[PDB]
Symmetry: D2
Subunit: 196 residues, 4 copies
């Protein structure tokens, strides 16, 4: 019986696997959606079965918060791994070990597993996460297969662009980021894309 | 942020490989037959190709099983879009990315042109069946390398008489096993013996 | 990539613990018997960071080897300390866990090779692989994944007192559906 | 746990058919003033017989060869010496350590891989692709033979004449291309989304 299957869960029941997202990206998703008119072809979101019966969301937090904020109750899911034989301790370890969690808060601090929110509606806003998204969307770096590429870019920017620039003027913060992305200083980042 | 759910008729799915192991197909059939919306149904990865064509990217054993059991459609998920490309380039892109596997039932390389266009035209590669069976018996580990099993099928086809495989499969499996465990097979993915 | 050289006592580790039994075994090879090359990452200062082979490099150190060839596989020396560890972590090139599998912070990663803490479950998982327990694999820190699984299921005391006994137990857990979720699992499906 | 050795570069067996000569000419001029305690180590597979197969860096070794460097350090990173020859190529292909495409992008049998660096064919588009990445039109990436996939995309869209008779027009047309929607599917793509 050869693999993943469609299922269906209440968004209020998904367990997050990261502490933060960029609310700006969330809000853009919510516009797109607010402005589009069976089950074919809604979003499917990948998930892992954890302890008790719980499903842990593995990607697409922005989209899931967007949908949740739009009043959408359910989302299609596909279980891509089954760890429900583990206790909770072991589970988080295995997840951590397999790079399926990202316990970093809105100001980029490593935090413990227990600090990972239990409901989606508790994600924190990481404004550098939004900046790093927009940067990519602008052509500042490439998508790469590395997990949490964006969060790497967000940490780079956060040490280099003033938060006050970012709330004052997003596009000027973006313009800065764009000057930095291209500099030799960002050379060590995944997806880096400039003159050698 | 992106993936959506879709459907095709299986007769419209375009394969990306030439052979499968028919024993493994029959086991998947036997199962399906024996399990109890659209919730519960199988979903398979697919790349958008030239004209409007969906190309199945993994799970050929399952797709053929399902097709041989009469099942008319399957749930899919576009995971890449190359409809902007023309035929030649698409095919080349496909290989550059190892989304294709054009080796025939006797393990020989062929040209994109030789890839079947229905699931129903897949050849039987019996050493691919032996490799699956060897994995399930715990002769080596699953591993994320694409085509791990076919790499094993090749090892075995250089070493185990084809005939033995029809005469006694369990004998072919025991042979496979004693090779899986030895240093001869150490270069293979998922290798699992004494160091 | 091109080739260089440091004193071993100058190499910066990137993990807290290694399996001391495995280290002792590696000695006995090198001892009972084409120099060794080892990948390193250039960080803050000219400074060299060892990205693998801690067991082997420590074994060399304990045998009195002064130096070791090395191959620099990445510069990060334009970064401060902090950004550096952050990057290392994101790149998964650090394993900041101690002898009991406990997450410690990047600053608690030791500065010298002989400051490596001993984890016996790393040693047991080591041995389990060599015995056909599970498959070498591309996943990073794979043996530590196995050491965590064992450490929750085999008495530390049994491990310290009788290694064969622990390994027989580990063998039996390795082939069982409880281990199915681990990298390299090799059991009857 | 790898170890070092050297080989005569004649004795090293290649693993692809083509390199970009413009890229080899470059590595030669750069190399030219610098100035074994810090030489180059290059990754190699131990093959059937005692033969050693170059795993990357053909552009570089060709450059050495052509400045009369005789040996090179090497790190044996895989051992396939227990295999027959036929098996050996097949495992090579399976692990994507060979690139049997000639200077035209055309797929050739593994028999047609040259047995000496000095027979590497010139793929002008490979050189374009190298200069393109260097201009920052796309990005390095963990994927196997990326530059080549970009050679193959440019080879389809910019006639050969512009390459031989004017490198930079060529570089420039390449750049407008690497930023467009048209290249979205390439690894490293970096244009506006």
């Amino acid at each position: 019986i050869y693999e993943p299957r469609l299922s269906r869960i209440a968004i209020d029941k998904l367990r997050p696997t990261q502490i933060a997202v960029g609310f700006r990206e969330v809000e853009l998703k919510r516009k797109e959606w607010r402005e589009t008119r069976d089950f074919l072809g809604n979003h499917i979101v990948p998930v892992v079965a954890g302890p008790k019966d719980r499903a842990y969301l593995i990607d697409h937090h922005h989209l899931v918060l967007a949908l949740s904020k739009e009043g959408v109750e359910h989302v299609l899911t596909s279980e891509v791994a089954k760890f429900s034989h583990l206790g909770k301790d072991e589970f988080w370890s295995v997840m951590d070990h397999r790079n399926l969690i990202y316990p970093f808060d809105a100001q980029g601090l490593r935090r413990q597993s227990g600090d990972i929110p239990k409901n989606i509606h508790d994600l924190e806003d990481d404004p550098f996460r939004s900046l790093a998204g927009a940067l990519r969307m602008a052509g500042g770096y490439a998508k790469v297969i590395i997990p949490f590429s964006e969060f790497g870019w967000a940490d780079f920017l956060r040490r280099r662009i003033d938060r006050d620039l970012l709330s004052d003027s997003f596009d000027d913060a973006l313009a800065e980021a764009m000057k930095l992305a291209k500099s030799r200083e960002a050379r060590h980042l995944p997806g880096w894309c400039g003159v050698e």
